[PDB]
Amino acid sequence: QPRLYVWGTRICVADVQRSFRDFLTTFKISQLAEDENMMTGHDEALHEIDVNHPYYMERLLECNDAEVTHINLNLKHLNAFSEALYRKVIAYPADVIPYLDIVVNEVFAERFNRTLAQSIELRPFNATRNMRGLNPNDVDQLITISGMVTRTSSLIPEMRSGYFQCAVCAFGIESEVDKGRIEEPVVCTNCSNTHCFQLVHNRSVFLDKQVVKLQESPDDMPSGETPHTVSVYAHGSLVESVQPGDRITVTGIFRATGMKVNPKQRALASVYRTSIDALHFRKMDTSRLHQDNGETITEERIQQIIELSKRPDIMDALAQSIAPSIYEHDDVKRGLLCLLFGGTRKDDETTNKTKLRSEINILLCGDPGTSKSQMLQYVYRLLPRSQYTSGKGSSAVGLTASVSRDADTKQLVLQTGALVLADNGVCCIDEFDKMNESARSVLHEVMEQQTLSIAKAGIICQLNARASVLAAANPVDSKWNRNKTIVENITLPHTLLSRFDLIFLIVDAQDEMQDRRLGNHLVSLYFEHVDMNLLRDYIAYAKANIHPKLSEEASQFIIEKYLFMRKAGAQHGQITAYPRQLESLIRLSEAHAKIRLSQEVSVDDVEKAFTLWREALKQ
Amino acid sequence: SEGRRTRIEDSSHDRVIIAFLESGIDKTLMHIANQPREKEFHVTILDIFALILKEQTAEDLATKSEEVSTAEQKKTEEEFRKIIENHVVKETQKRKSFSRFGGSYTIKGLKGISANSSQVVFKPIQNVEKHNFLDDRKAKKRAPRNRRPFEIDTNSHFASSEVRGMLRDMVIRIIETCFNRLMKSSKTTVFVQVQKTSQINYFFLIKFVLRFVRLSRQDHLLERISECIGVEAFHENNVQLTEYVENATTLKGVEAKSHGLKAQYALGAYNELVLLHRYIYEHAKEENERKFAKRALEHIVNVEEYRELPIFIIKKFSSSVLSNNFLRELVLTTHHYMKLVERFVKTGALKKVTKKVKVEEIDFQFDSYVCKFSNVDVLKWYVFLLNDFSKNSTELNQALVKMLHRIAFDLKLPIKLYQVSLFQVFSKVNEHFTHLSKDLRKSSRLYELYQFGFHLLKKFFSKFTGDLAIEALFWKGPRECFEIEN
DNA sequence: TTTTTTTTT
DNA sequence: GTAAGTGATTAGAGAATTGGAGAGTGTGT
DNA sequence: ACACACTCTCCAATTCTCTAATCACTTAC
Ligand SMILES: Nc1ncnc2c1ncn2[C@@H]1O[C@H](COP(=O)(O)OP(=O)(O)NP(=O)(O)O)[C@@H](O)[C@H]1O
Ligand SMILES: [Mg+2]
Ligand SMILES: [Zn+2]
């Protein structure tokens, strides 16, 4: 009996398929600890996975009901079931993956007695290494690496089967493309002429392909190395599933290819180019506020959040849990909590444009050695979409967008900057007083109108940049000077200063008791905070579900407080108030009501917002 | 050069026909043709009416034309429903065929050309029987240019209801006013003349008119075509057909093709003569007419020249000088003639037969007559034409299957049909039937051929042996059949 | 071509 | 009617005509 | 140097003709 073997390895195909069928029908072990992005399915809207069944048999119900066409295969479960199969999967992905697919399709057809539009496809994931640690032994093996997405290409059509037509008698033949090659017919079987066919391109069949560029994480590296970049190829349904600015983990096959010395000729260079063929993208990360509009939270944790919101301590409880290693600065922590929550979104949905800004901007200004950079680092690490820039390390064009000439098409093309990557996120700008004036002056349009309009050679367009700006700086003399006023210790234009919603003056209150307490706190690092898992869910639920509106009493109160602000700002040696500060007060009031999970802004919320704004600046 | 036109609309020839008939000059031409005194115009008028009916068939005009636009709208919507569903199913099958990654594999148990080697494949094959030994690459061998089959193309279309109604009226008026006088005046002269083409026009017009009368069932018109009903018609037709076949076989080149073209039209006219005489003998109301038809049918069945004609033509067939249309016509002619001989044996009217030596009378046996067609030189062309089963007409498919079925189950001799070149046809038919559900298979028009292939292959595999599988590679003669059987 | 960066006058 | 002899038909081999594939060589980019 | 085009040569297929063997018909007992 003829039998099929993988070339040079003595692996037979069917004996693997038997064990994998057993794995699919039988595995139920890990379901006590189901993961965050894997514990829900759906027939319509959303539904929750049951523990007690065979797990992938349960997951196949989603393919029947919601007509999903893929299964995410966690390889840790397979390794727990049988290492003898896990080794074969990792060692020969280019040979065994075309048959585990067929076992899945067989089990689906047997279970449901049904067909589908496309075959159910496998995506193995969660097999980790570094980009520099790859060797020639790893060619065609399964690997997984992580990084940030900087750029994505436009789509490329890749043919799978061509269509020939005879020039003499209009007969037509199909021809499969395989091993990278097509076979051309020579003799027409109808009219019996030779060397006679012509390929018709638009009658043939193509597939999608995309190129994605990935960058090293800087954390793990040894001494003196600069970060590397790698090309990742996405085929089929993975195409356009990721944006620039996202942080991801990729599982795929590591490959190597040759290159021609001249494009005209058959000779090849003996040093090969390398890339990755993708199989799975993962973006789930539990160390940050989650990136998914909070769709998957359970009813029980929603009720726990609703119960937690009724503490009178809710502002202090949420605020002091942020940045736990930082001592005191409670007012600054409350300001950062307001930055995290934000106001109500106010967009034109016909044009997809912001009518009014709802993001909150904060400046910190104070003495040296007061942990401003540390607070910036905490906010940078907490959020999913964040950028960090510092001092003279930035340019005006690099902060916003740049024009460069393309490598092959020789056209001028446009590419992103920090504020465009930080869209729906936070940009942290350290050493803000030491930037070049050219670099600092482009921030006006972004900080006010949340858009960015460009007019250079052949490029006239407008971009959206819905970012929040958090900045830190020193006074003119690096130590705060008491022989000068506030608008002389700070020196920025009024056009720039009026665009911040909060300014925090941090001046060293020199006192022996405060010195002793802070010294005890700092020395102890060498020897009722809300849980991070609850804080994540609280912020996401509040953002998705709470939209405060102003009450009429609150609106009258806001007008009265704005008149008081206009009188107070006019005195000598003080920051003047413009009509922009009325918008700032409305944003802060909505943020306080949003923290309380209230659909209406009250006079108490306006009072708390005004008190925070006033006491931030009276130093 | 003016453009390409579909097969279901009016030809450019039809517009000239419309102008010609709207002028009414055809009535004057018919009036001239009716006069016995004006003989010199008659051959040309016959040529004119044949050239008018050049692009038509009798089946187009025989059915009376009627329509309702409600039914037409419903019918066209169902046609495009068929087209849309075919496209969606084909595209989803093709896009589901593809597979993602590659590799290379060894088929353990199959030998390679080079020593100690197993077979190697470079695509993820589903199962070992899907392997093909890369026959898709290899270039097909061609016949030389002198020996390829060729069709003869007549621009043939389903014209509009207006043109079909006008032509139907013209055909009926010709039969009523001209036909007997015109044919009687022509037959004395057409074969004496120097010019060749009026012979072809003569045979074409005979074939068209007799088929139109039989299919339209206008039985009162049978008096008007009485010039063609006699035994003399069969005699004269047989003489001309024999001369054309001999010249086409013995000459070479375009001259041989030119004589074979005459032979084709003569054969078609002969077939219409046979079918018309059977229709008269079955459905005429007057017993005198029935007796007149019956005596002619008995003459055809009795005399050796009419009974030996199909084998005589089949043994001389050659694709260098005769068209495929000739072979299809010959197969259908043989089918109808053998049905006539079978009925005249079954009713007992044929028992003893005259044979040349002096002439002597010997008993006749229908199985002895059928056994002549089991020769290899006949069965070659039946297997040749069975390859085109997916585009043959249903009548031709029935004729081919019936001739094979007689040898399979009336003479009961399946060893002569055990042959590889027929098993290839069965393989194609089976692949065609895989794409249909069990109900649609019984609904299909090819189910007769499928069922016959089923029974013959089961009879083959009932007693399979390896030496029998070797014997399937060659055509088997009579002693070969005896020694294989015994 | 036009655009962006870092050393020099 | 049966047996033996002679004539005719069929099968094989040799020779000549026709056509197409393949390989080699020359020229142009 | 490499690709493309053109020309020449050989070999195989087919058909006619001649020769030999086997089968069938005719003649004689
Ligand atoms: N209240 C505090 N809580 C925690 N760490 C503190 C505190 N005050 C000072 N530190 C420490 O002192 C250092 C402050 O550095 P840094 O974060 O740069 O402050 P800074 O405001 O940015 N000063 P500078 O950037 O020079 O203007 C860090 O090592 C902190 O850990
Ligand atoms: Mg610092
Ligand atoms: Zn063709």
Please report, for residues A344, A433, A544, the alpha-carbon distance to residue A338 in angstroms, rounded to integers and kept in the order given. Answer: 12, 24, 16
- SS3 at position A468: strand
Three-state secondary structure of A589-612: HHHHHHHCCCCEECHHHHHHHHHH
Q: Which helix (H) or strand (E) holds B179?
A: helix B179-186
DSSP state at residue A530? P
CA of A189 to C1' of E5 (A): 26
| A397 CB-to-strand C distance under 7 Å | yes
Binding-site annotation: residue ranges of A: 327, 353, 372-373, 474, 499, 580, 583
Q: Which helix (H) or strand (E) holds A103?
A: helix A93-112
Q: How far away, in angstroms, is A320 Cα from ligand 1 center?
A: 18
- Nearest residue in chain B measured CA to CA from A193: B142
E-strand stretches of B16-143 = 105-111, 118-121
Q: Which of B440, B81, B91, B179 is nearest to A205 (CA)?
A: B91
Angle made by CA atoms A236, A240, A244, in degrees to the nearest 5 = 145
A301 vs A531: CA distance, rounded Å: 13
Strands B105-111 and A3-6 come out as: antiparallel
Structure tokens at A300: 């029980």
A574 Ramachandran zone, left/alpha/beta (phi>0; psi -120 to 50): beta
**A533 contacts A286 by C-beta, under 8 angstroms:** yes
Binding-site annotation: residue ranges of A for ATP: 327, 353, 372-373, 474, 499, 580, 583
Strands A362-366 and A412-416 come out as: unpaired
Residue in the structure block whose two tokens are 């083409």 = B197
Mutate to test the interface with A, among B92, B108, B117, B150 (most CBs of A within 10 A): B108
User: Could you please report the per-residue DSSP string of A31-84?
Assistant: GGG--TTTSEE-SSS-EE--SSS-HHHHHHHHHHHT---EEEEEHHHHHHH-HH
A258 vs A270: CA distance, rounded Å: 7
Pocket test for ligand 1, best of A333, A374, A431 (most atoms within 8 A of CB): A374
Which residue pairs, CB below 8 angstroms and at least 24 apart, start in B95-102? B95/A118, B95/A205, B96/A118, B96/A119, B98/A160, B98/A161, B99/A98, B99/B123, B99/B124, B100/A97, B100/A98, B100/A235, B101/A93, B101/A94, B101/A95, B101/A97, B101/A98, B102/A94, B102/A179
Give me the amino acid identity at A271.
V
B473 vs B159: CA distance, rounded Å: 48
- SS3 at position B340: helix
Question: For A2, which of B98, B100, B109 is closest by C-beta distance?
Answer: B109
Three-state secondary structure of A163-183: EEEECCCCCEEEEECECCECC
Residue in the structure block whose two tokens are 């084909």 = B90
Angle made by CA atoms B416, B422, B428, in degrees to the nearest 5 = 160
Sign of the four-CA dihedral B57, B62, B64, B67: negative
A326 Ramachandran zone, left/alpha/beta (phi>0; psi -120 to 50): beta
Q: Which helix (H) or strand (E) holds B210?
A: helix B197-216
Instruction: Supply the Cα-derived Rg of chain B in whole angstroms.
Output: 28
Strands A70-74 and A600-601 come out as: unpaired
DSSP state at residue B475? -
| B144 CB-to-strand D distance under 7 Å | yes
Give me the amino acid identity at A22.
D
Strands A401-405 and A412-416 come out as: antiparallel
Q: Which of A390, A394, A387, A472 is nearest to A424 (CA)?
A: A387
Q: Which helix (H) or strand (E) holds B164?
A: helix B161-177
Per the entry, the structure determination technique was cryo-EM
Three-state secondary structure of A531-564: CHHHHHHHHHHHHHHCCCEECHHHHHHHHHHHHH
Residues in chain B: 486
The resolution in Å comes to 3.8
User: Could you please report the per-residue DSSP string of A369-384?
Assistant: SSSHHHHHHHHHHHSS
Q: Which nucleotide is nearest to A458 (CA to C1')?
A: C2
CA atoms within 13 A on the CB side of A1: 2
**A307 contacts A588 by C-beta, under 8 angstroms:** no
**B301 contacts B344 by C-beta, under 8 angstroms:** yes
Residues whose CB is under 5 A from ligand 3 (ion)? Answer: A 166, 168-169, 171, 188, 190-191
E-strand stretches of A457-579 = 459-464, 468-473, 502-506, 549-550
Structure tokens at B486: 């015994």
| B146 CB-to-strand D distance under 7 Å | yes
In terms of C-beta density within 10 A (0-12 exposed, 13-18 middle, 19 or more buried), how is residue A224 classed? exposed
Taking the CA of residue B423 and the nearest CA in chain A, the distance in Å comes to 21
- The count of other CB atoms within 10 Å of the CB of residue A366 is 22
Residues 448-467 of A with CB under 7 A from strand C: 456-457
B297 vs A57: CA distance, rounded Å: 77
Q: Which helix (H) or strand (E) holds B240?
A: helix B231-250
Pocket test for ligand 1, best of A371, A377, A514 (most atoms within 8 A of CB): A371
A301 vs B432: CA distance, rounded Å: 61
A348 vs A83: CA distance, rounded Å: 55
Strands A247-260 and A459-464 come out as: unpaired
The reply to whether residue B125 touches residue A4, judged by beta carbons under 8 angstroms, is yes
